[PDB]
């Protein structure tokens, strides 16, 4: 019923007929999804249950009526009718690390997906973009992986044609993947289960999975499809964390700390009530290697070609420099090894 | 022991006001926020560069200036002898002497900067 002629030449006074609404579009990844819809001229409805000054850099991202923001309740439907009436896209990007007092795992990764989901059947939404984890097992060793495979079968269940996508470990500027091993120096040496020898990841830079939403959502053949977003190189643990700590020019200390302690201590950092340094699921998440998922499309399908992390980690382990290391090139600094 | 305590206890607030400092409000760093002040625009050049000191006679001179300084405190017991007189010749010798010195410099254009 909501069906807009695109009009423009793509630029930010544009007409892309794109209107979304991006839940959880308060993240890192919201703000790229945001920015790319924002920038075609797409009416982009962004819900929030934080405090509007948290939803500020978001404003500029849009032209003069293009950014609606408006409250919404995760444990309220009526919030959610309202936020995706108007809606002929819907993205949901909600989901928290970490469980908290009000919301656990089960809460953010399976309740409030099957609501977007149902919800927006209601209203008639045409598209959905559902964002799970490509490690999401049913019997994974981590929670919040767990929860991430329940909630992907509901979704389906509740929108049958809803587009789902899998990144592997999002890097960027606001990331807590490549940030968290670089924050890893103030606690003196990195511990790593098996010395990060029997884990191996694959990380995705956060603008192309921004750009694989936006090429979902612009594909007409993505409904029903279920994407993994993967990146160019799979990288060994030790590897990868040595050139972390080598483009941001820190002493690397490694030394292998056993699965048991390393649960321990990941126990006592959930003791702080704000956001926890480190959890026992993001232990087990990290020490997880990635799953390779060959009979799923990827970026390469949707016509981005996935960005190497050597070329887009100085952006984000400049700031973890010493003033010494500050003007360093991007070239001196040696690729690691790559698991191919 | 009692200005040792003195100077713990006012070392330990301005530490813990420090912490307080860094550790109560919300951090939200990046970047760009950290980058040198440069009003606006970004610095040509390092800060650590060398920055030329056009008075740096006068520090040079104000050493020994404050050398004679040291030297004149011990004034205020030195008037309780007994020879006066050899007392206070010497102590206005010094006095000229600080003089003459501020002046040689003041004359041959040393006070001076550039
Ligand atoms: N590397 C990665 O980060 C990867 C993440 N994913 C998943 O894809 C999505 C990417 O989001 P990401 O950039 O990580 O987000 P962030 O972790 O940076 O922020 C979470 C976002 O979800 C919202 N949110 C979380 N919990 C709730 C809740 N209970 N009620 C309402 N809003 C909530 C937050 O709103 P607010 O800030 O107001 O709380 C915020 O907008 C997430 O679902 C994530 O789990 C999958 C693969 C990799």
């Known amino acids: ?340 | 022991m009692n200005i040792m305590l003195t100077l713990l206890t006012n070392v330990t607030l301005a530490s813990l006001l420090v912490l307080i400092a860094f550790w109560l409000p919300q951090l939200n760093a990046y970047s760009e926020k950290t980058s040198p002040y440069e009003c606006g625009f970004d610095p040509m050049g390092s800060a650590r560069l060398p920055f030329s000191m056009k008075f740096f006679l006068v520090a040079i001179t104000f050493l020994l200036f404050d050398l004679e300084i040291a030297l004149l405190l011990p004034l205020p017991w030195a008037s309780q002898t007994n020879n006066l007189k050899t007392m206070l010749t010497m102590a206005l010798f010094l006095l000229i002497l600080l003089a003459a010195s501020l002046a040689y410099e003041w004359t041959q254009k040393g006070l001076e900067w550039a």
């Open chain 1, 1 to 340: 019923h909501h069906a807009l002629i695109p009009h423009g030449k793509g630029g930010r006074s544009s007409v892309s007929g794109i209107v979304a609404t991006v839940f959880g579009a308060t993240g890192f990844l919201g703000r790229y999804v945001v920015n790319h819809l924002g920038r075609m001229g797409s009416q982009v409805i962004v819900p929030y249950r934080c405090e509007p000054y948290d939803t500020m850099h978001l404003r500029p991202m849009g032209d003069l009526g293009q950014i609606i923001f408006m409250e919404w309740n995760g444990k309220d439907k009526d919030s959610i009718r309202k936020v995706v009436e108007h809606s002929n896209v819907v993205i949901n990007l909600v989901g928290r690390e970490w469980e908290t007092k009000n919301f656990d795992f089960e809460d953010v990764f399976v309740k409030i997906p099957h609501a977007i989901a149902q919800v927006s059947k209601e209203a008639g939404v045409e598209k959905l973009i559902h964002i799970s984890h490509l490690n999401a097992d049913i019997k994974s060793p981590s929670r919040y992986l767990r929860s991430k495979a329940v909630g992907e079968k509901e979704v389906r269940a509740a929108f049958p044609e809803a587009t789902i996508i899998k990144p592997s470990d999002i890097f960027g500027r606001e990331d807590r993947f490549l940030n968290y091993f670089a924050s890893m120096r103030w606690f003196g040496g990195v511990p790593l289960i098996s010395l990060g020898k029997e884990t191996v990841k694959q990380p995705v830079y956060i603008v192309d999975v921004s750009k694989g939403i936006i090429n979902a959502i612009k594909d007409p053949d993505a409904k029903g499809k279920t994407f993994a977003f993967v990146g160019p190189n799979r990288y060994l643990l030790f590897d990868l964390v040595q050139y972390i700590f080598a483009v941001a020019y820190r002493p690397f200390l490694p030394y292998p700390l056993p699965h048991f302690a390393y649960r321990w201590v990941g126990r006592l950092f959930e003791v702080s009530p704000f956001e926890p340094w480190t959890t026992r699921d993001k232990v087990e998440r990290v020490h997880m290697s990635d799953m390779t998922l060959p009979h799923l499309p990827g970026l390469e399908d949707l016509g981005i070609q996935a960005t190497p992390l050597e070329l887009k980690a100085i952006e984000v382990l400049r700031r973890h420099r010493t003033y010494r290391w500050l003007t360093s090139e991007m070239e001196d600094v040696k690729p690691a090894k790559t698991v191919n």
